[PDB]
Amino acid sequence: ASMKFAVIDRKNFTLIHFEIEKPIKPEILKEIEIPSVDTRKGVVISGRGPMWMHCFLAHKYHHTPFVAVYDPRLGAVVVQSHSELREGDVIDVVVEEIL
Amino acid sequence: ASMKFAVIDRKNFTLIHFEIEKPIKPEILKEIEIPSVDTRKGVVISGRGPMWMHCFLAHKYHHTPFVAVYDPRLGAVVVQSHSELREGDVIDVVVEEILK
């Protein structure tokens, strides 16, 4: 039960948001079931969690056109791409959680 | 000028420490010049920075045997590997930073 993912498909990318419920150990990277996605599109990843969670997930979608990582102050920052965008580009995205 | 790297070699991996000094924009990922390393060995990355910096760096060493990311509470957590360790393994290394 210890993490939830929410997946949202957009014309140009799939947003993947993760939420940690119980506290977690790094073993969990062996077990966790990653959401599958249209790989013809790039991917944006968000969530509060340790950096290792973000890195792990980013690597897992490295075959997609691009992977970007959400920053509350900025939007989604592209950290690697095969095609559509360049490392360091920013996709204009805002994520909000019910208050 | 706005980021420094330090490299420390070990038998089984190369530690890469980064430090941000001025605040930075994501454009910087286009300019950054990454330290080169013995690629026969995996790599450990440590440094305070936004998630995107960590991810960026981790991708850049993806040809090495493994990439692990340092967590003060835990050690260095493997987040991808081609060869020596498994995702989620923890290298038991203690890193300490000094004011100077």
UniProtKB/Swiss-Prot annotation, chain A:
Q: Which domain of life is it from?
A: Archaea
Q: InterPro entries of this UniProt entry?
A: CRISPR-assoc_prot_Crn3/Csx3 (IPR013409)
Xref: Pfam families? Cas_csx3
Similarity annotation: To A.aeolicus AQ_377.
- What is the recorded name of this protein? Uncharacterized protein AF_1864
| Organism of this sequence | Archaeoglobus fulgidus (strain ATCC 49558 / DSM 4304 / JCM 9628 / NBRC 100126 / VC-16)
